Amino acid sequence: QKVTPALIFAITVATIGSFQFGYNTGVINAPEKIIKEFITKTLTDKGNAPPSEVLLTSLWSLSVAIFSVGGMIGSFSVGLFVNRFGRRNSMLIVNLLAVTGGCFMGLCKVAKSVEMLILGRLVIGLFCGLCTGFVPMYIGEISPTALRGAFGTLNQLGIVVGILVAQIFGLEFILGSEELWPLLLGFTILPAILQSAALPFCPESPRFLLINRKEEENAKQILQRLWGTQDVSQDIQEMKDESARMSQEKQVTVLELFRVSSYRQPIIISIVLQLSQQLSGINAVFYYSTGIFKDAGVQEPIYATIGAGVVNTIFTVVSLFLVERAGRRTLHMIGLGGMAFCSTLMTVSLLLKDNYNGMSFVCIGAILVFVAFFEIGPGPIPWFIVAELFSQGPRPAAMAVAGCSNWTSNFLVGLLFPSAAHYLGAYVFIIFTGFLITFLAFTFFKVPETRGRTFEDITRAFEGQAHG
Ligand SMILES: COC(=O)CCNCc1ccccc1-n1ncc2c(N3CCN(c4cc(F)ccc4OC)CC3)ncnc21
Ligand SMILES: CCCCCCCC/C=C/CCCCCCCC(=O)OC[C@H](O)CO
Ligand SMILES: CCCCCCCC/C=C/CCCCCCCC(=O)OC[C@H](O)CO
Structure with a gap:
């Protein structure tokens, strides 16, 4: 601070x-x-x-x-x-x-x-x-x-x-x-x-200037301005450490990210977290919304979506004020869990859609609560976490891989979901509940807490796990 x-x-x-x-x-x-x-x-x-x-x-x-x-x-x-x-x-x-x-x-x-x-x-x-x-x-x-x-x-x-x-x-x-x-x-x-x-x-990243371009005093002066203090010795030294590591290590391309044991777990976490975002059902919830909104008397479709957009914004801010205290693990898991509850509710409320005349209001409620849980963790976290799972050397190649898998999984979901919905109907949300539960289990057992830890601390811990 x-x-x-x-x-x-x-x-x-x-x-x-x-x-x-x-x-x-x-x-x-x-x-x-x-x-x-x-x-x-x-x-x-x-x-x-x-x-x-x-x-x-x-x-x-x-x-x-x-x-x-x-x-x-x-x-x-x-x-x-x-x-x-x-x-x-x-x-x-x-x-x-x-x-x-x-x-x-x-x-x-x-x-x-x-x-x-x-x-x-x-x-x-x-x-x-x-x-x-x-x-x-x-x-x-x-x-x-x-x-x-x-x-x-x-x-x-x-x-x-x-x-x-x-x-x-x-x-x-x-x-x-x-x-x-x-x-x-x-x-x-x-x-x-x-x-x-x-x-x-x-300014350019002081980390990049010091570690990649070996411009230590340039980074310091920038660091002093950005953090508004003249004493930045602890951070400058930690960057010196990361720099020593990078010049002693082969700089990784995409293909070797998968050949190095100490990179395998971080990169697998990175990809899986991208999937936990795009296979959450967040792209299915609105596919149904525009038609559910008519039934509840909206008769104003873009207005129904804007409202979701406001909720979208509110709980991103909630995640902002929680992520340094609660940690990434907890917020990701809570969000996955709340979405599991809501997608299940979606299936039930849709299955009872016309045996009971209130269910469209139920579905809308489920959709808005879903959006809230999405932004608690799975929305914001997967974007910045892979940057935390790697040190300076492999980060760029890792973020190329992670980001691509996020965009690709988004593209494939959009291609395949209309078919799945056509064959499964209301039960399609149960499939996401399964995904969400599985992702929740992955995070609980495989994803280390990165909050407040230096890149060096995080990397060494992955190196330690790989030595046995
Ligand atoms: C086809 O137009 C759209 O997707 C807009 C859908 N409504 C937006 C909306 C309104 C109210 C509340 C939540 C939302 N959503 N919904 C999804 C969504 C979201 N993601 C999921 C999908 N993603 C994405 C979308 C693309 F297109 C192309 C590439 C993408 O990642 C590489 C990035 C992060 N993040 C925040 N709010 C979201
Ligand atoms: C009908 C209206 C027609 C007239 C409209 C006149 C607009 C003039 C141009 C504005 C540039 C828009 C700049 C967008 C600002 C980006 C917001 C931003 O940077 O985000 C803040 C924060 O960092 C988020 O987390
Ligand atoms: C009727 C009995 C009353 C109970 C009704 C409950 C209704 C469903 C609640 C969902 C909230 C989502 C909770 C998310 C659960 C995930 C667990 C979790 O986040 O774990 C964090 C971990 O322990 C940190 O290390």
């Missing part, structure tokens, strides 16, 4: 990327009908026959999904940037992609080009994939050890705030209209121009 404006500024400017990721994730839902009308008109205006609903659904599905494909590629490409350019400059450099993607999506209507929309979603996907790796890596290396998890939770906060804002902007009376939806999608350009202006005044 040594928090000056500089540290806040640096972390806040970095979480613009988190906001960007959240915004582009949530922005696409509301304007579906409007964009399909655009796609139809683009073909009709040629004088051609109007497209079938099958073709529209097809093009629309590609628009949505190609974003994930971009993210898979970008998140796995994180390793190409962070050691070569640094952590701060990597973020500055890739804003080219955010500007590019936003231009395509923003100009696709006036250019009357469905192809530009699809292309824009791919490029903004690439950008967001790089962000999901760059931001926690930067925050992790620049935060005081006692606040590493708290600050790391600001990544997820930026993401959920980004989602909320995109949804609100998606309202018909704001930017969600026939004449304003290019502005809706094009909006992502503005935070990029703001971030690029602000970033050069954010």
